[PDB]
Design a protein around this nucleic acid. Structure first.
Ligand code: DZ4
Ligand code: MG
Ligand code: MG
Length: 430
DNA sequence: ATATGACGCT
DNA sequence: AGCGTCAT
């Protein structure tokens, strides 16, 4: 009873940039600001594949994955910006550099774990402690929280959204024990105040807006972040979890969006995260394994222990390209040439990495996909990465995959290759 | 015919 | 080591 931990030990935030590639293009080109807008790669097939969408465009039903020509049928005024193309492939440098701007600002507040090109987790537990002693039991003003939502509030005994926001925040603050420095809810509130500040600094210094989740672990933080996007932050407290989870589809929780999530639904005959509570940990372990069962048992009670790993930099650097359908590489010369293109971008990125971050990759991984295999990768092999030299790197990769070629003729390659992928890995200090 | 990155399993 | 899962 007093021995049951509640997963309330930490304050953890997840910050995610609003329509990130779109914002990067909109900052560069004022003409695209406050417009239905999308970022697109490869204008040649159906106008390009959409990979990011402004919220004005979303309101017309434009989504990621969609072809640009089809997006124009839903939204004829849609403005587009194209991904840089270098060496015959998509080049994401602009967005990687924009990402670094954001991560450096967040780094100033606390230790971040970079989770994607546009998001990081933040462990606020220490910052909240320090901010709490400087505050000295002084009540927290709703003015310190001008973009914050308290999930599940307002409740009990207004028409438009900002009215509802404030009402819920007033209820939350009015209930707040500012007397006890170790109250979990109080810790979350102070965490929210800091994330208000962090998000203001990001906007001020970059022009980019973002949303945030503030809770006790990574999973709740990521879930909370999405609940009030764009340009808003959401606090999910321990106590909000039962109602929140009671109608929350299983697939919405991080790691349960694929096969395992589907098997939980299937095997257990449930739909919502909260329904998991009626199962014993041993029952869950028997159906899904020791670690999965353990993790589900605690998670459906809002408890999770994945720590925020102190890592602002990626652990691999990679370049890939699909060669779909009729463009699938079918000769030795095409394979070699495209491996050189990939190796050339890779080298440019590794040398920049070695100078910026005082480390060097030591292993090269080569990955291909062949026509008809619908796996991401058909095959992976590796070799030593000794020199940041594109010509050597591509030669080495060709060497380690050449024998996949099932062809009779010298100059032909079969089966045709639908993807090439070079990944530098196993970094070491230098 | 939609470019990446992290991590688990064996 | 090489493959399978899940993610943006
Ligand atoms: N399948 C994919 N292929 C290529 N790039 C992608 C991608 N998914 C995302 N990106 C790139 C482009 C994206 O801009 C960026 C961040 O991805 P999100 O945070 O999942 N989506 P956004 O930040 O745009 O919208 P909001 O967060 O407001 O919902 O990563
Ligand atoms: Mg985002
Ligand atoms: Mg994101």
């Amino acid at each position: 009873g007093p021995h049951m931990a509640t997963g309330q030990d930490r304050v953890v935030a997840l910050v995610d940039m609003d329509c990130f590639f779109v914002q990067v293009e909109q900052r560069q080109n004022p003409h695209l600001r406050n417009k239905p807008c999308a970022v697109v790669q490869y204008k040649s097939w159906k106008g390009g594949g959409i990979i990011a969408v402004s919220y004005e465009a979303r309101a017309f039903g434009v989504t990621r994955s969609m072809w640009a020509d089809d997006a124009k049928k839903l939204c004829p005024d849609l403005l587009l910006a194209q991904v840089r193309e270098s060496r015959g492939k998509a080049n994401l440098t602009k967005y990687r550099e924009a990402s670094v701007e954001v991560m450096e600002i967040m780094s100033r507040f606390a230790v971040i774990e970079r989770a994607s090109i546009d998001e990081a987790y933040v462990d606020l537990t220490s910052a909240v402690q320090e901010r709490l002693q400087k505050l000295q039991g002084q009540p927290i003003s709703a003015d310190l929280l001008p973009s914050t939502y308290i999930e599940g509030l307002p409740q009990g005994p207004t028409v438009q959204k900002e009215g509802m926001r404030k009402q819920g925040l007033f209820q939350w603050l009015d209930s707040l024990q500012i007397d006890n420095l170790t109250s979990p809810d109080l810790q979350l509130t102070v965490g929210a105040v800091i994330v208000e500040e962090m998000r203001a600094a990001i906007e001020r210094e970059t022009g980019f807006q973002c949303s945030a989740g503030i809770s006790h672990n990574k999973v709740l933080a990521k879930l909370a972040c999405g609940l009030n996007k764009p340009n808003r932050q959401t606090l999910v407290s321990h106590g909000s979890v039962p109602q929140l989870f009671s109608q929350m589809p299983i697939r919405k929780i991080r790691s349960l969006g694929g096969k395992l999530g589907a098997s939980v639904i299937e095997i257990l005959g449930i739909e919502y995260m909260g329904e998991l509570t009626q199962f014993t940990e041993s029952q869950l372990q028997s159906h899904f394994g020791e670690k999965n069962g353990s993790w589900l048992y605690a998670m459906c009670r809002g408890i999770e222990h994945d720590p925020v790993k102190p890592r602002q930099l990626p652990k691999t650097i990679g370049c890939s390209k699909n060669f779909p359908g009729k463009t699938a590489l079918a000769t030795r010369e095409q394979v070699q040439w495209w491996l050189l293109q990939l190796a050339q971008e890779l080298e440019e990125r590794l040398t920049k990495d070695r100078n910026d971050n005082d480390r060097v990759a030591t292993q090269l991984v080569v990955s291909i996909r062949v026509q008809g295999d619908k796996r991401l990768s058909s095959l992976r092999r590796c070799c030593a990465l000794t020199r940041y030299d594109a010509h050597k790197m591509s030669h080495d990769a060709f060497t380690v995959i050449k024998n996949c070629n099932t062809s009779g003729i010298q100059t032909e390659w079969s089966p045709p290759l639908t993807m090439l992928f070079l990944c530098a890995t196993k970094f070491s200090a230098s």
